[PDB]
Amino acid sequence: AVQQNKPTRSKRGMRRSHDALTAVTSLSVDKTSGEKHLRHHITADGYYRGRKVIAK
Amino acid sequence: METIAKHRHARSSAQKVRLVADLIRGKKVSQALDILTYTNKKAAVLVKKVLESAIANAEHNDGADIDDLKVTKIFVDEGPSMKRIMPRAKGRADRILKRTSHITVVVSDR
Amino acid sequence: ARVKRGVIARARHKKILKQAKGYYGARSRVYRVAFQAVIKAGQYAYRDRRQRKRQFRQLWIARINAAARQNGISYSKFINGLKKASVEIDRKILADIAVFDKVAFTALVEKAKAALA
Amino acid sequence: MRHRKSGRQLNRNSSHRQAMFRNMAGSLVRHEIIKTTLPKAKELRRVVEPLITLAKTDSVANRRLAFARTRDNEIVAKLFNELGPRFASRAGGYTRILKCGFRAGDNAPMAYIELVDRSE
């Protein structure tokens, strides 16, 4: 089962109208280190909710 | 003024990079850097390197201030396609296209 | 004497594609489709050069009928009355008067009614 | 349907899952903190925490059960001689999952899972 007609660049764009990525709405800010991090994840410098949880 | 950074012949289809590029079009560069930092795409890494290169071009070549810069232009063009053979069943060959893209990021304060 | 036919072929395709602007999709960018669409546009343009005269006469007749019925007479009896009164005003002018000079159109309707009476 | 069912398949057959969580429980016991994938850490809770609970009582039979479940005598020793006493008064919840982002090679969602008292 293959197309009988070449679908248009318009239908291609129409189908891709749902492909847009969602940006992360907002980053959270660690209360201790003040550096931005993904919500409920550890900071890239090992903090989490103001506590240092890992030494990396 | 406007400062450009290009990553030409990036190894990724422009369609994939364009998702990320649309994600940070028109944003302030700090906000764009955050968005790219948390966007789980290979294209986000490439676009982030281009954006950081653009910011450094602006601050160094054009004496801009990072806090003023916005991503005023972030198109992704198609670059040349590398052409490769995928052997398929029954002796058939397909040619796959390893599509490259050119990423252009323009930052400016205006 | 070999002739490279690239320049003239480019020019012909460009002529057609310049005529094909505004057309949807391949019709405005793909020469095969564009040429078909340009030809069909030409046949429509001819056929409709004809169709325009009758569409506009149709519009005028409808407007005259409307105005004449505002003056208590059908279009048919109005046109017959105008002929019997020897008034030779086109449907175009009659409709234009019906819209823009309702008093003069009323006068025309009286003239036709006198002719018919 | 999987109404009310528990336990993640994790795209492994059962004996692979059991082997993997035995190894992962041993890793967590001996290192007290391990990076793994978030679903794997959430399932690892359900194996490690019962091992610690079991080790809160030090009998020969309980060391035998622990050894059956861990197959590592160093892990059993650390469970009964350190972890059991370290969690003697803690009513469950011996681990902590800390989401730590996404693994580069496959974008996998990653978490740290640690013993709760790993600080001291």
Add this chain to the structure above:
Amino acid sequence: MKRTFQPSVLKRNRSHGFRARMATKNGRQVLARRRAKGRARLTVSK
């Protein structure tokens, strides 16, 4: 699947080698044709 090319250097040289071609009138014609066409490798001879 056994495939049709089962290499053997000895059989290759005996069937298409330089000496085999020089052995007959038609082999020498093959060589003459290949020289005239200018081929870098006249024969299978490695």
Add this chain to the structure above:
RNA sequence: GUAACGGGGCUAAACCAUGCACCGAAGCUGCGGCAGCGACGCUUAUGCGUUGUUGGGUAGGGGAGCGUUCUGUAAGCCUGCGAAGGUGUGCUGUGAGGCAUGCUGGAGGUAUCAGAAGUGCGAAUGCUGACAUAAGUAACGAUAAAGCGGGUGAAAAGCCCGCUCGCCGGAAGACCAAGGGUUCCUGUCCAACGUUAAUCGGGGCAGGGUGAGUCGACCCCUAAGGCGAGGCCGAAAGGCGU
């Protein structure tokens, strides 16, 4: 699926008769324009003065042209004060077209009247290249299976180290022949190749590495068979054979 008025609707908005209106085509008329063929008087390179009339068209016949490359005209003319080509725009002709000019371009172009053709593309499941589409879809090649810690790294699910786990174990281990031919080892690099990432590699690059009286080959010897002095045979080529 109403589905036997095109529909709505209609008791006329049906039917019959009569009558006058009107609508209605690219028919006809009007106005403007072009062309063909006639007939007329002045004549000519026919202009016209007019004047009738004709002008749907496939196969096809006839007539007249546009434009492209090349030759002459041309050691001329245009051209770095910007050629060709490209891309716009404007104007222009009945058309093929033509002219001008903005931008690009950066060195060629070429009137006129002749001359010659690889002289005009949308089709030929045409040919070559490029690029789409399906679509970021299928798939990523045995369902032996991974987990974690440490290292290195810009980055590690995949590399290195470690500890577990699993799988083969008349093999999925080991040594070879054949075949390949540097894939070997070390260093280094990660564009491309690796169906992912790769710091890794049978990838790139460089350097290194193959040591024989006894292993093998060569060699001595013969099989099948080949070739074959002479020879026999065969137009020739050559066949057969001592």
Add this chain to the structure above:
RNA sequence: AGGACCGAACCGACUAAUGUUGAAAAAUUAGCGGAUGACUUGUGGCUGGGGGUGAAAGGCCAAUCAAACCGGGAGAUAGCU
């Protein structure tokens, strides 16, 4: 003893499923037949295209076979498309 029997290697290929842009231009998996013989296999050799070879299917003769392949006559011819 045996073209004996059961059954691995080895040789095959009866059934089914899968696969059919395959992992694969004939395989995989589960079964299946032969398995001291008219067996099987390595290496080399010989047979050449109206020819070979064939426990015979027009089978096979380099994924090609009611006349191989390559080159040539050759721009065969094509009242057909």
Add this chain to the structure above:
RNA sequence: CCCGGCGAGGGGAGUGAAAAAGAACCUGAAACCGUGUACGUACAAGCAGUGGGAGCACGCUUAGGCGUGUGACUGCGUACC
């Protein structure tokens, strides 16, 4: 010099008449793919045009209105070979 991995790629600087001549290099067309702007488009059925045509946008103009772009709505309209 700068970003970047002592990358790739790029931004400056400089060379040059020219670097949008930078080696993926004269000219750089088309398909094809984007970014920006203008207009339209989420109650509307079909070769996608054509005839009519509102509205908007822009550019001219000394008004006056013309150019342009778009094109709601509407009559007609089933590609080419």
Add this chain to the structure above:
RNA sequence: GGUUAAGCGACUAAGCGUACACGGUGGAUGCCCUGGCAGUCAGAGGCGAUGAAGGACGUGCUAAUCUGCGAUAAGCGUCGG
């Protein structure tokens, strides 16, 4: 002026279209010629057991390839320029 009611109603663009601007891809076009093509005139019409045609290997300050050359090896002697 306020409320209610009724009627009408712009502003949305996930995307998409058309136009335009600017790009990308691509490599057409034009321009170019140390390559071909066809000849004319004229030479020469052979090379080889004094080892040919064609090659293999080697040969440099040389890693490769090409050209040359041949262990006297990008060359040696001599005669001339």
